[PDB]
Each structure stands twice: as C-alpha cells, then as structure tokens.
Design an enzyme around this catalytic site. Sequence first.
Site, mmCIF file in Angstrom:
data_model
loop_
_atom_site.group_PDB
_atom_site.id
_atom_site.type_symbol
_atom_site.label_atom_id
_atom_site.label_comp_id
_atom_site.label_asym_id
_atom_site.label_seq_id
_atom_site.Cartn_x
_atom_site.Cartn_y
_atom_site.Cartn_z
ATOM 1 N N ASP A 1 -6.137 0.387 0.803
ATOM 2 C CA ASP A 1 -6.130 0.669 2.235
ATOM 3 C C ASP A 1 -7.475 0.241 2.820
ATOM 4 O O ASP A 1 -8.266 -0.430 2.163
ATOM 5 C CB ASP A 1 -5.989 2.173 2.459
ATOM 6 C CG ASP A 1 -7.278 2.915 2.144
ATOM 7 O OD1 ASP A 1 -7.886 2.626 1.086
ATOM 8 O OD2 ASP A 1 -7.693 3.777 2.951
ATOM 9 N N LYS B 1 0.829 -1.205 0.000
ATOM 10 C CA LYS B 1 0.000 0.000 0.000
ATOM 11 C C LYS B 1 0.866 1.260 0.000
ATOM 12 O O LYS B 1 0.650 2.175 -0.796
ATOM 13 C CB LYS B 1 -0.936 -0.002 1.222
ATOM 14 C CG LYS B 1 -1.803 1.255 1.401
ATOM 15 C CD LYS B 1 -1.149 2.280 2.330
ATOM 16 C CE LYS B 1 -2.095 3.467 2.601
ATOM 17 N NZ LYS B 1 -1.546 4.526 3.516
#
Length: 214
Positions: free
Chosen positions: A139, A121
């Site tokens: 996320d 991420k």
Amino acid sequence: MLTKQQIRYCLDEMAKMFPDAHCELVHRNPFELLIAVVLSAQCTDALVNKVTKRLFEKYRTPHDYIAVPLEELEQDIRSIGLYRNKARNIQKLCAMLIDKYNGEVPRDRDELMKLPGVGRKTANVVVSVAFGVPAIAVDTHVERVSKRLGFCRWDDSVLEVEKTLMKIIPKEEWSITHHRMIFFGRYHCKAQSPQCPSCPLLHLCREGKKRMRK
DNA sequence: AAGACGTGGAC
DNA sequence: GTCCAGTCT
Ligand code: SF4
Ligand code: NA
C-alpha cells in the site's frame, strides 16, 4: 539500494519498535474483512471503522448489499469517499460471490482479484489476515517506507516492491513484517512528518540523511 | 496509459 | 487551502 543484510536489519528494528503491529480494520469474519478492505482504498482506517460500525449491522451477507438500490448503499458509505465507484463495485462483488463462489469469500488470491474493486493489495490483505496465507500487501505506507529506506528504487512498481520483499523475507514472516512496515510508515516514517531525528535507521537511510541535512 | 474517483482529517 | 489516507477505464 541497501544490501540484503541491511534490509533485514531495518525490518528487525521495525519489529522492535512495533512488536504489536496488526490489521487495524474491525471485522468479525472474512466477508466483513473483504468489504472493509475494499472501502479502505485511499481512506483512513478510522473512517472505515466508524462507517462499517453501522454498515455491518445493516448488511450482513452479500444478498443484503444487492437487495437495496445503488443510491441507498451510496449514502450508507458516503463518508468513505470514492463512494459511487465503491458502492457499485460492492454490489457487483456480492453478485459474483453468489454466482461464482458459492456465496463465500474465495481463499485464492487470484480468484479474489477477479472481483470488482479488488486489486492485488486488497486480495493480499484478505488472504493474509482472513486465511493466514503468507502475502505482502503493498500500500502507500509499505511503498513509501521501502523507497525511502532504499529497499528498492524510487521508480519501482508496487509489484516490484512486493517481489523484493518476498525474496528477502522468509515466507513464514511475510504477514507480520507487512503489518510492522505499515505501522512504521503510519506512525513513524509518516508521509508529511517523518520522525527522522529519533529514527533507529537514520544511520543507513538515504531519505533521512537528506532531510536532516535540511 | 495517464486521469478520474472523493469525503474527512491533519496542518 | 494543500497534502495524504488503490482500482478501474
Ligand atoms: S530516517 Fe526518516 S525517512 Fe528514514 S526511515 Fe527513519 S523516519 Fe523514515
Ligand atoms: Na478486481
């Protein structure tokens, strides 16, 4: 799960709802972005920005972070939470930039992931925002929105979510769609209070119809 | 592989 | 007094 056509319909609507969606972390260069995103894990943007406001005045280069005792940096970012691990990761990350990447933030996603504290991420946000490389950072918001709407299955991994989106969205639109999804989840399809009653996607949302019925 | 990490804000 | 804002061992 929704059909490709439907998922594209959902994304098109999110674009109409949040036409100005962007990265909300304050930064002036790639290095500041990298530190900010690392601190962003499991923390609110508001708190990260309040902290980096002063942090980026005290520290400006990787040499500044490794020049202070670990205990000192810990206090400087204490309000972020998870500060012991983050402070340690930041010092190790800065040492690696110097030793392995000629003191600069690498532009490769897989190379960024070699840094401590940086996962997929974090690396995706950095290459996308800092270097314009198309990528979809998954996320909490992106995952939640994807699963509620039926873009993927509830048991899918975040990597699975990412691959699903990459196949449905043109590479040229990956970065902005990512931001639009984050805004949709942050301000509309919230974790605790989703705005289902006034949602333009309620007509095809399994989660929304399930909540409205209750 | 489940489990630790963590302060700050929203109810 | 819960619940929410990724990475590592
Ligand atoms: S209907 Fe509700 S659960 Fe579905 S996307 Fe809209 S706000 Fe989210
Ligand atoms: Na890493």
